[PDB]
Design a protein around this nucleic acid. Sequence first.
DNA 1: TCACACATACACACT
DNA 2: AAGTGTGTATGTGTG
Length: 79
Amino acid sequence: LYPCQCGKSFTHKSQRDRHMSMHLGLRPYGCGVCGKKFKMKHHLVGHMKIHTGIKPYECNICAKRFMWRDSFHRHVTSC
DNA sequence: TCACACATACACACT
DNA sequence: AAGTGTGTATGTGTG
Ligand SMILES: [Zn+2]
Ligand SMILES: [Zn+2]
Ligand SMILES: [Zn+2]
């Protein structure tokens, strides 16, 4: 078992390390276009969509691609 | 081979 | 309306 700087003892090393990296504020994944640094890969992956303009999540009726999952979920809820 | 174990991506939920 | 954090299912690695 792997203790952390919060009292949470994680089962797996990797989860402790992810948690600690968040604690420190380390941001190893930076954008090579704008210059913002993110602490996790998928954060930077999602952010890249604004540089690359990829607009996924096509609405099933209204035909409105959205960049972000929550925006698409709200539009599907409303429309 | 293969049975298992841990890392990592990705959905999903927040701020 | 994009950044931040968590939980978990593959995928890869290994003995
Ligand atoms: Zn911690
Ligand atoms: Zn960027
Ligand atoms: Zn619609």
